[PDB]
């Protein structure tokens, strides 16, 4: 909207075409990461970590 | 007993099955019925002249060869020369009414009966006749009610010198001198009846037929038309059992039984219209294709909550089949790319096709605990706006409006201008330059310094908290 | 002055039939296609069940085609696809319609139990269905020929009848015929016709059924509805977003069942439209019409036919009637009941440090709850630039916010609730106290009111947002404002268990202990003696005390004396404020005395002193109890030394009786009962042996030789004090426990000879199992019985609220002590306390006005009556209150959590119903809880007695015809009464006596219908309260008789006319209406006459059935029937009740809202 558009103009941030869906720790539960698994569809390239 | 399946099975069970000969009985009647109306249609002069007026529009590139004829009884060339024959037979028959005409008016019909017209055009003729005949009846009822009901004259003597005329004045002004009790009463309405006769006798000019002939033709036509439907209806009733036997195949495909047999019944209706017993095809084995055509064409079309094109369905069906041999053959079941090779197409479309193919799940599907907790109760609104945002929106105006009164009256005007702030749309910087009479680069410069003026803090400390 | 047009704040509601043109008014377009969404681009297909043209934009303020995407553009209809760009919200509002080819019947007016269309036409249902399925032809407007207007013909018969008469007679079939009938029907002409026939033929069989129809018809006439509208031309379609197609994860879709239904009706409708232009044969278009009729029915209410099932899923698709309907009535208002923001919950714990007005609230819970407040307070002082920065701060949890939260928390009550909310104390307001940790801390004294044990029960918290909600919580729902049960005036904040063992162990005395005999100046130096270890808590001591008495006129006298007491009671005196005497604390202070202590403190000094008092009692109770070091060891449970000997002697008796049965001296049945009695008697012996030994056997010495007092043994102190345990439960620990009962209920003739201090062997435990499981089952079921009962109760009362001040009637009921067969099962003082006098009461002598006319009888007044010998008092009751549509404050009583007379506007019906229902858990499975329900259901017993119908001499007439007639003969009045009574039932009635009307003409129970009819209103209400109160009091449950009286008043709300002049003679109707109406004739219009009525007795569940508001009835009754039966009459709901105002979501026309509704209700019928 206009005032948001002014906001980006003043603080000069390029508003991305992508939205943040990242999985984040629920509020208040806190622990140590003991494992990670990556399941991938057959045919998509496994990323570095995977 | 309710359950419309039962009251149908029993309403049709009354109609008795046709004998192998009996099928032909009704069918002969059909031909007879239609041929009567065809002959009844051939006898209309305006019906001829209209086709003439229509073909001159075809040769004038005002229509296409497909929008008038479907071909006759016996090509652009062939079409051109056949119409000339019609035009030829018309102009002889036309001038001979000096009685003896009868012999030639019979021939004008013959050429006209070879033409099988596109159904739409045919209907307009039929429409035009009855519309023209309503036009006659309108005038017929006016002259009677203004005489019989208003001026109090009996219909017994009103029809005596009528038969044969109902146009000229023998009945209107010459029946008033018979000195009957109802005779002298006819003078009062004269102005109103005789002026409306214009359209009545004009019909005999347009149609070129006296009000005498005008009734007979489309009356016989009505009889034939009526006759046709009678026979056709009769035929359909005999074959309902067939539709049921065919529709019993398609039950759970996702449409109701009675949904099926009704769509199938229509298929049976189509079959009667196009059937010819002269081809020696048993009517039983001929309609099956039409009924079956109707069932599937409907099931494909309307049986889904998300309607999908036909080829998509057929695409889908092949896939189930393939999974079958390969199901036990591969011992578990084929991989998402296995049937892909089996199928012609790009094979990654399997995934795309597989998505739209799923049927939506009932939002009332009871989930866990059975506690009337239902799936739909768990579907959150994503189009809503949480108040913690809407609150910051009401605030962001107050933020930006304040910082804009902290600037020069022109910087606020210029910045509210470059953006949509409290104004419909925003303005290209060229438009803004013209508004100020001081234009172009000048304005572009001021904007820069403005953003620069709110970048450093004192100003900057309040608006920064908006970013995350 | 101009009326209005746009949205004002509406009052009342109206319901009626919908015209086809009326349906078109709502409709913004015709749904012409079964299509939903495009199948690729998921956009709605124009024009189908989901349509931007008919209904609304998919996304906010944006055209569908995309030509107008700008937020400025609003009233703009896109030229490409007409879509006025406006919020997507309108896709939830705008309706639509469908134009049906053929008319279609509305299943609700067809299939609700009294088929409305059937009896509107006075035509049978099965026939109408026969006409609808095209299974026969029906006549309409027969003319003068051969045939009735409503007569039905078959195919051939119609043909036969037609050859004779072609025209001037008309018959159709199917829906169009029924619609033609309804249209042709002239109600006015028919009404007149019906009026004559009532008078002409005189027969009860005839005019009974006859009169029912004419009133109904004219109701429909005056209503404004036209009969034709029961047949649907146009069908409205519900807004798309109320039956959404919304996507899910994995790209799959989910949708409401209505689409499948709506789609079907459309397809079939459309197919039928096609079949008309194709001139299909009759047999098909007929079949298509039936299929369309079935399809519409499946849409509206599925299940009145075959119950169509949704596509590919066995489960039947849910129709519109099932969306409203449910269990029970509406889901919206049914428990539960709508989810609510600003709430939470967690496990609860103690927190004795808390004052009674506050509660421990976890730090994080308070943070997430007050989140909007914190934002506003944070940006009020400028610690956060803006709300966004504030959000980040509490999300960052900067340390600075904690001080700000203590500000926003301070004066701001929170509501605490437990799971089975029964009485109003199930919700109470508290002041928040910030607590590290995730557990809720709850003031111990309240754990009784909540029935909240600590076994892991969880409580829910609610934040009172609006200012009015904060002040409602503080001045009504606050903890400190309810310390007294509204069920009975006794304090519900009574210290519970740990505290009373503290105070019991504190004020108690042994014979010889440190400090015995000495004397002290005052309690201050008494504690100084104890705390230093010089004096024992219990030792006999004289100390100087200063007590106070306000016995002057509102004024405190002081008195000092030497009281003979102990050290503990001396120490305890420090807490007792001012005007209480030392007598209250000079005793041993059991749990019973410690509540009546609190009661007196409240009834004397008021509220404020009582609250802080209660706090102090708890603090000192816990403290000294902790000092006491009370514990329980295995040697604390003392078995009688004589137990084994008692068992053997009783073991000898069975062998005596056994020898008698083998030798035939006694019968088998006689054996069972004999043995059971001696074993039972044995149990009492062991119980009362160990009780004597356990209680006093502590035998101790002071200076002299020996002496013995009440035991200081641990387990005894608990039971004597009232802390925990009872002689019954103790008996199971030390003495033998009971004789269990086999599932059959036949108590076993070999009891459980062991106890818990010893071991139970295999058989004894296995036999013990049944009692436990049936106990749990019974209670778990008794849980269910109670809930339903309170439900039935609140449904019949509810809307009852204190409205007027004084109805000004001298009328009331006579209050005497209950005197059940022995001595005083309940005194007079409890029965009359807090009520208001009907008339002044005299001494035993006269020319003495004790209590002057109507006066609240409080504690002094009841004692002044008790000083004197006063044996009987007449009291205004809610059953006698002259106020119509409510209770006059004087007729009810004072009772509340406050002692003052009941305020104007309190909703008493609910608190009455809640108070009766809540204790119901403790009743048994004649007797018990189902017995209570029979009373409230008015249910006639199986073999009732019969009462003299009229006074005068009676005799027997005719002879055993399976009934032998009884003839009563009044002296002056008419004789004619002879009732046929089966004579094989034992009579009582003296065959030769004059019987007062209402005497016992036989024995056995009596129907309360009689008592009302023959004996009178006061008699039956006295009967109910005393019988139902018998049940509760037998369990030790205190329920003031008031609450039961209000339920009773609701049972008899309706009455049946006798005389005439303006009303319906035989009509059952509200005595409220009648009484206000006969006042409208005694001086108004014609006297006319009249009319005399007869009060009727309705059971609670039947009386709740009749409710003026249909929205209320649609809640708890059968919804379909309510809406139909209401929709025909065009009934206009004025709200006014509670149930309905909750539904529509406005102020309850009671309590705080009562001022409002009152101010609005009067604005009405004015100008
Ligand atoms: Mg408890
Ligand atoms: Mg518990
Ligand atoms: Zn558009
Ligand atoms: Zn009263």
Curated annotation (Swiss-Prot), chain A:
Superkingdom of the organism of origin: Bacteria
Membrane-spanning segments: none
Use in biotech settings: Co-administration of salinamide and rifampicin or salinamide and myxopyronin suppresses the emergence of resistance to both antibiotics.
Post-translational modification: Acetylated on several lysine residues in the presence of glucose.
Subunit comment: The RNAP catalytic core consists of 2 alpha, 1 beta, 1 beta' and 1 omega subunit. When a sigma factor is associated with the core the holoenzyme is formed, which can initiate transcription. The rRNA transcription and antitermination complex (rrnTAC) consists of RNAP, NusA, NusB, NusE (rpsJ), NusG, SubB, ribosomal protein S4, DNA and precursor rRNA; S4 is more flexible than other subunits. In pull-down experiments interacts with CedA.
Family recorded in the similarity comment: Belongs to the RNA polymerase beta chain family.
Free-text function comment from the UniProt entry: DNA-dependent RNA polymerase (RNAP) catalyzes the transcription of DNA into RNA using the four ribonucleoside triphosphates as substrates. Resistance to the antibiotics salinamide A, salinamide B, rifampicin, streptolydigin, CBR703, myxopyronin, and lipiarmycin can result from mutations in this protein.
Annotated protein name in UniProt: DNA-directed RNA polymerase subunit beta
Annotated organism of origin: Escherichia coli (strain K12)
Curated annotation (Swiss-Prot), chain B:
Keywords: Cytoplasm, DNA-binding, Sigma factor, Transcription, Transcription regulation
Subcellular location: Cytoplasm
Disulfide bridge partners, by residue number: none
Protein's name in the database: RNA polymerase sigma factor RpoD
DNA-binding region, residue intervals: 429-448
Domain topic, free-text comment: Contains 4 domains, connected by flexible linkers. In the active conformation, the domains are in an extended conformation, each making extensive interactions with the RNA polymerase catalytic core.
Domain of life: Bacteria
Chain intervals for the UniProt region annotation (Sigma-70 factor domain-3): 314-390
Assembly, per entry: Interacts transiently with the RNA polymerase catalytic core formed by RpoA, RpoB, RpoC and RpoZ (2 alpha, 1 beta, 1 beta' and 1 omega subunit) to form the RNA polymerase holoenzyme that can initiate transcription. Identified in a complex containing RpoD, the RNA polymerase subunits RpoA, RpoB and RpoZ, CRP and DNA. Interacts with Rsd; this prevents interaction with the RNA polymerase catalytic core and with promoter DNA, and as a consequence, promotes transcription from promoters that require alternative sigma factors.
Segments of this protein annotated with the region Sigma-70 factor domain-4: 403-456
Motif residue range(s): Interaction with polymerase core subunit RpoC: 259-262
Chain's gene name: rpoD
Region named Interaction with anti-sigma factors: 440-455
Protein family: Belongs to the sigma-70 factor family. RpoD/SigA subfamily.
GO biological process: DNA-templated transcription initiation; negative regulation of DNA-templated transcription; regulation of DNA-templated transcription initiation; response to heat
Effect upon mutating residue 409 to D: Disrupts the interaction with Escherichia phage lambda antitermination protein Q
Residue(s) at site: Interaction with anti-sigma factors: 418
First-to-last residue of the parent protein present: 94 to 612 of 613
The UniProt record lists the keyword Transcription: yes
Keyword DNA-binding included in the entry's annotation: yes
Organism: Escherichia coli (strain K12)
Ranges where the record places region Sigma-70 factor domain-2: 235-305
General function of this protein: Sigma factors are initiation factors that promote the attachment of RNA polymerase to specific initiation sites and are then released. This sigma factor is the primary sigma factor during exponential growth. Preferentially transcribes genes associated with fast growth, such as ribosomal operons, other protein-synthesis related genes, rRNA- and tRNA-encoding genes and prfB.
GO molecular function annotation: DNA binding; sigma factor activity
Swiss-Prot record, chain C:
InterPro entries: DNA-dir_RpoC_beta_prime (IPR045867), DNA-dir_RpoC_beta_prime_bact (IPR012754), RNA_pol_asu (IPR000722), RNA_pol_N (IPR006592), RNA_pol_Rpb1_1 (IPR007080), RNA_pol_Rpb1_3 (IPR007066), RNA_pol_Rpb1_3_sf (IPR042102), RNA_pol_Rpb1_4 (IPR007083)
Effect of substituting residue 690 to V: Resistant to antibiotics salinamide A and B
Consequence recorded when altering residue 773 to C: Resistant to antibiotics salinamide A and B
Bridged cysteine pairs (disulfide): none
Molecular function (Gene Ontology), one example: DNA binding
Biotechnology: Co-administration of salinamide and rifampicin or salinamide and myxopyronin suppresses the emergence of resistance to both antibiotics.
Keyword set includes Acetylation: yes
UniProtKB keywords: Acetylation, Antibiotic resistance, DNA-directed RNA polymerase, Magnesium, Metal-binding, Nucleotidyltransferase, Transcription, Transferase, Zinc
Binding site for Zn(2+) 1: 63, 65, 78, 81
Annotated effect of mutating residue 751 to S/T: Resistant to antibiotics salinamide A and B
Biological processes annotated in GO: bacterial-type flagellum assembly; bacterial-type flagellum-dependent cell motility; cell motility; cellular response to cell envelope stress; DNA-templated transcription initiation; intracellular iron ion homeostasis; nitrate assimilation; regulation of DNA-templated transcription elongation
Phenotype when changing residue 775 to A/C: Resistant to antibiotics salinamide A and B
A GO CC term attached to the entry: transcription elongation factor complex
Recorded catalytic activity of this chain's protein: RNA(n) + a ribonucleoside 5'-triphosphate = RNA(n+1) + diphosphate
Keyword Ligase: no
Cofactor(s) listed in the protein's UniProt record: Mg(2+); Zn(2+)
PTM entry text: Acetylated on several lysine residues in the presence of glucose.
Enzyme class: transferase
Subunit structure: The RNAP catalytic core consists of 2 alpha, 1 beta, 1 beta' and 1 omega subunit. When a sigma factor is associated with the core the holoenzyme is formed, which can initiate transcription. The rRNA transcription and antitermination complex (rrnTAC) consists of RNAP, NusA, NusB, NusE (rpsJ), NusG, SubB, ribosomal protein S4, DNA and precursor rRNA; S4 is more flexible than other subunits.
Family in the record: Belongs to the RNA polymerase beta' chain family.
């Amino acid at each position: 909207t206009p005032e948001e558009k002014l906001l980006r103009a003043i603080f000069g941030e390029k508003a991305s075409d992508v939205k943040d869906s990242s999985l984040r720790v629920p509020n208040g539960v806190s622990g140590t990461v003991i494992d990670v698994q990556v399941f991938t569809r057959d045919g998509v390239e496994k990323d570095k970590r995977a | 007993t309710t359950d419309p399946v039962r009251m149908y099975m029993r309403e049709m069970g009354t109609v008795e099955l046709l004998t192998r000969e009996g099928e032909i009985d009704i069918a002969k009647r059909i031909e007879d019925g239609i041929n009567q109306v065809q002959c009844s249609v051939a006898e209309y002069p305006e019906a001829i002249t209209y086709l003439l007026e229509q073909y001159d529009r075809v040769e004038a590139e005002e229509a296409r060869l497909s929008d008038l004829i479907t071909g006759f009884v016996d090509d652009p060339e062939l079409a051109r020369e056949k119409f000339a024959e019609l035009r030829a037979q018309y102009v002889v028959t036309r001038d001979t009414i000096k009685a003896t005409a009868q012999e030639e008016i019979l021939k004008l019909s013959e050429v006209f009966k070879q033409f099988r017209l596109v159904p739409k055009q045919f209907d307009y003729l039929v429409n035009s006749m009855r519309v023209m005949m309503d036009r006659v009846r309108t005038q017929e009822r006016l002259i009677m009610k203004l005489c019989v009901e208003q001026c109090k004259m009996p219909k017994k003597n009103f029809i005596t010198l009528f038969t044969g005329n109902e146009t000229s004045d023998t009945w209107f002004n010459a029946a008033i001198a018979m000195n009957k009790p109802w005779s002298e009463k006819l003078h009062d309405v004269s102005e109103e009846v005789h002026r409306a006769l214009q359209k009545l006798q004009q019909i005999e000019e347009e149609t070129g037929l006296t009000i005498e002939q005008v009734k007979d033709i489309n009356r016989r036509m009505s009889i034939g038309e009526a006759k046709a439907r009678r026979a056709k209806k009769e035929m359909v009733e005999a074959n309902l059992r067939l539709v049921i036997s065919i529709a019993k195949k398609y039950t759970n495909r996702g449409l109701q039984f009675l949904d099926l047999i009704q769509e199938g019944n229509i298929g049976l209706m189509k079959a009667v219209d196009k059937f010819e017993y002269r081809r020696g095809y048993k009517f039983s084995t001929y309609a099956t294709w039409w009924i079956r055509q109707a069932i599937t064409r409907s099931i494909a079309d309307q049986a889904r909550t998300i309607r999908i094109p036909v080829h998509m369905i057929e695409t889908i069906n092949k896939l189930n089949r393939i999974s079958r041999q390969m199901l036990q053959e591969m011992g578990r079941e084929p991989t998402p790319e296995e049937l892909a090779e089996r199928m012609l197409m790009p094979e990654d479309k399997i995934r795309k096709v597989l998505k739209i193919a799923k049927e939506p799940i009932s939002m009332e599907t009871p989930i866990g605990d059975d506690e009337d907790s239902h799936l739909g109760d768990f579907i959150e609104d994503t189009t809503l706006e949480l108040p913690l945002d809407s609150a910051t929106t009401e605030s962001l105006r107050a933020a930006t409006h304040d910082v804009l009164a902290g600037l020069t009256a022109r910087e606020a005007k210029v910045l509210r201008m470059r953006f949509g702030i409290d104004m419909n749309t925003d303005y290209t910087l060229e438009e803004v330059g013209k508004q100020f009479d001081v234009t172009r680069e000048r304005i572009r410069q001021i904007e820069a310094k403005a953003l620069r003026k709110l970048r450093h803090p004192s100003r900057s400390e309040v608006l920064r908290s908006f970013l995350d | 002055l101009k009326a209005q047009t746009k949205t004002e704040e509406f009052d009342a509601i109206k319901i009626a039939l919908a015209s086809p043109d009326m349906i078109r008014s709502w409709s913004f377009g015709e749904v012409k296609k079964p299509e939903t969404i495009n199948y690729r681009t998921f956009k709605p297909e124009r024009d189908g069940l989901f349509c931007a043209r008919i209904f609304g934009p998919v996304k906010d303020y944006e055209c569908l085609c995309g030509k107008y995407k700008r937020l400025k553009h609003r009233g703009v209809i896109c030229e490409k696809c007409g879509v006025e760009v406006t919020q997507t919200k309108v896709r939830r509002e705008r309706m639509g319609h469908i134009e049906l080819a053929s008319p279609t019947a509305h299943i609700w007016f067809l299939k609700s139990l009294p088929s409305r269309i059937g009896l509107l036409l006075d035509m049978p249902l099965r026939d109408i269905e026969r006409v609808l399925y095209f299974e026969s032809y029906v006549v309409i407007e027969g003319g003068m020929t051969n045939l009735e207007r409503q007569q039905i013909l078959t195919e051939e018969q119609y043909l036969d009848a037609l050859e004779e008469f072609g025209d001037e007679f008309d018959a159709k079939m199917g829906a169009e015929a029924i619609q033609a009938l309804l249209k042709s029907m002239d109600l006015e002409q028919e009404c007149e016709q019906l009026r004559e026939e009532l008078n002409e033929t005189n027969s009860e069989t005839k005019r009974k059924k006859l009169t029912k129809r004419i009133k109904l018809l004219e109701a429909f006439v005056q209503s404004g509805n036209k009969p034709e509208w029961m047949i649907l031309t146009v069908l409205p379609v519900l807004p798309p977003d109320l039956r959404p197609l919304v996507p899910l994860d994995g790209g799959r879709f989910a949708t409401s069942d209505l689409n499948d239904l709506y789609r079907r009706v459309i397809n079939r409708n459309n197919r039928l439209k096609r079949l008309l232009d194709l001139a299909a044969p009759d047999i098909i278009v007929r079949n298509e019409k039936r299929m369309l009729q079935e399809a519409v029915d499946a849409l509206l209410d599925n299940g009145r036919r075959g119950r169509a099932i949704t596509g590919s899923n066995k489960r039947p698709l849910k129709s519109l009637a099932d969306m409203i309907k449910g269990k029970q009535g509406r889901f919206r208002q049914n428990l539960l009941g709508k989810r609510v923001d600003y709430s939470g919950r967690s496990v609860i714990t103690v927190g004795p440090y808390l004052r009674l007005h506050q509660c421990g609230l976890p730090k994080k819970m308070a943070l997430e709850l007050f989140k909007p407040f914190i934002y506003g307070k944070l940006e009020l002082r400028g610690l956060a630039t803006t709300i966004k920065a504030a959000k980040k701060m509490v999300e960052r949890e900067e340390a600075v916010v904690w001080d700000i939260l203590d500000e926003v928390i301070r004066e701001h009550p929170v509501l605490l609730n437990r799971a089975p909310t029964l009485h109003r104390l199930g919700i109470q307001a508290f002041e928040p106290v910030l607590i590290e940790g995730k557990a809720i801390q709850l003031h111990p004294l309240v754990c009784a009111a909540y029935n909240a044990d600590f076994d892991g029960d969880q409580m829910a918290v609610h934040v009172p947002l609006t200012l009015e909600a904060q002040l409602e919580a503080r001045a009504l729902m606050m903890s400190t404002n309810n310390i007294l049960s509204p069920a009975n005036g006794e304090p519900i904040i009574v210290p519970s268990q740990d505290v009373v063992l503290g105070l019991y162990y504190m004020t108690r005395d042994c014979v010889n202990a440190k400090g015995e005999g000495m004397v002290l100046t005052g309690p201050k130096e008494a504690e100084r003696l104890y705390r230093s270890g010089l004096a024992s808590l219990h030792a006999r001591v004289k100390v100087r005390i200063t007590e106070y008495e306000k016995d002057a006129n509102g004024e405190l006298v002081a008195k000092t004396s030497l009281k003979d007491t102990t050290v503990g009671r001396a120490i305890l005196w420090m807490i007792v404020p001012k005007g209480l005497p030392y007598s209250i604390v000079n005793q041993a202070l059991g749990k019973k005395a410690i509540s009546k202590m609190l009661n007196t403190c409240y009834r004397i000094l008021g509220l404020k002193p009582t609250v802080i008092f209660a706090d102090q009692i708890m603090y000192t109770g816990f403290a000294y109890a902790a000092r006491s070091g009370a514990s329980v060891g295995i040697d604390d449970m003392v078995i009688p030394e004589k137990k084994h000997e008692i068992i053997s002697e009783a073991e000898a008796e069975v062998a005596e009786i056994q020898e008698q049965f083998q030798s035939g001296l006694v019968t088998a049945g006689e054996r069972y009962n004999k043995v059971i009695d001696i074993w039972a008697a044995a149990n009492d012996r062991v119980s009362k042996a160990m009780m004597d030994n356990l209680q006093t056997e502590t035998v101790i010495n002071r200076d002299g030789q020996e002496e013995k007092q009440v035991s200081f043994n641990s387990i005894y102190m608990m039971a004597d004090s009232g802390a925990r345990g009872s002689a019954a439960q103790i008996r199971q620990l030390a003495g033998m426990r009971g004789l269990m009962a086999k599932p059959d209920g036949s108590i076993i003739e070999t009891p459980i000879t062991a106890n818990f201090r010893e071991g139970l062997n295999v058989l004894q435990y296995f036999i013990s199992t049944h009692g436990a499981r049936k106990g749990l089952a019974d209670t778990a079921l008794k849980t269910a019985n109670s809930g339903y009962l309170t439900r039935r109760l609140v449904d019949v009362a509810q809307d009852l609220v204190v409205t007027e001040d004084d109805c000004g009637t001298h009328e009331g009921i006579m209050m005497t002590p209950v005197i059940e067969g022995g001595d005083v099962k309940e005194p007079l003082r409890d029965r009359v306390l807090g009520r208001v006098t009907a008339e002044d009461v005299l001494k035993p002598g006269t020319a003495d006005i004790l209590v002057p006319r109507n006066t609240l009888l409080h504690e002094q007044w009841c004692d002044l009556l008790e000083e004197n010998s006063v044996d009987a008092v007449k009291v205004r009751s809610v059953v006698s209150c002259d106020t119509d549509f409510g209770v006059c404050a004087h007729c009810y009583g004072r009772d509340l959590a406050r002692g003052h007379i009941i305020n104007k506007g309190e909703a008493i019906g609910v608190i009455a119903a809640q108070s009766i229902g809540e204790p119901g858990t403790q009743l048994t499975m004649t007797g018990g809880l189902p017995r209570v329900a029979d009373l409230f259901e008015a249910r006639r017993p199986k073999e009732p007695a019969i009462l003299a119908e009229i006074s005068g001499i009676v005799s027997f007439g005719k002879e055993t015809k399976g009934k032998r007639r009884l003839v009563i003969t009044p002296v002056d009045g008419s004789d004619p009464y002879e009732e046929m009574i089966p004579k094989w039932r034992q009579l009582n009635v003296f065959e030769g006596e004059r019987v007062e009307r209402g005497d016992v003409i036989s024995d056995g129970p009596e129907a309360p219908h009689d008592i009302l009819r023959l004996r009178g209103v006061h008699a039956v209400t006295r009967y109910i309260v005393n019988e139902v109160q018998d049940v509760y009091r037998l369990q030790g449950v205190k329920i003031n008789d008031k609450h039961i009286e209000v339920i009773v008043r609701q049972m008899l709300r309706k009455a049946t006319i006798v005389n005439a002049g303006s009303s319906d003679f035989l009509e059952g109707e509200q005595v409220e209406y009648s009484r206000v109406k006969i006042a409208n004739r005694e001086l108004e219009a014609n006297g006319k006459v009249g009319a005399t009525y007869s009060r009727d007795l309705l059971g609670i569940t039947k009386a709740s059935l009749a409710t003026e508001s249909f929205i209320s009835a649609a809640s708890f009754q059968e919804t379909t029937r309510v809406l139909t039966e209401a929709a025909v009459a065009g009934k206009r709901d004025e709200l006014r009740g509670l149930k309905e105002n909750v539904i529509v979501g406005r102020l309850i026309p009671a309590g705080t809202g009562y001022a409002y509704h009152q101010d609005r209700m009067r604005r009405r019928a004015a100008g």
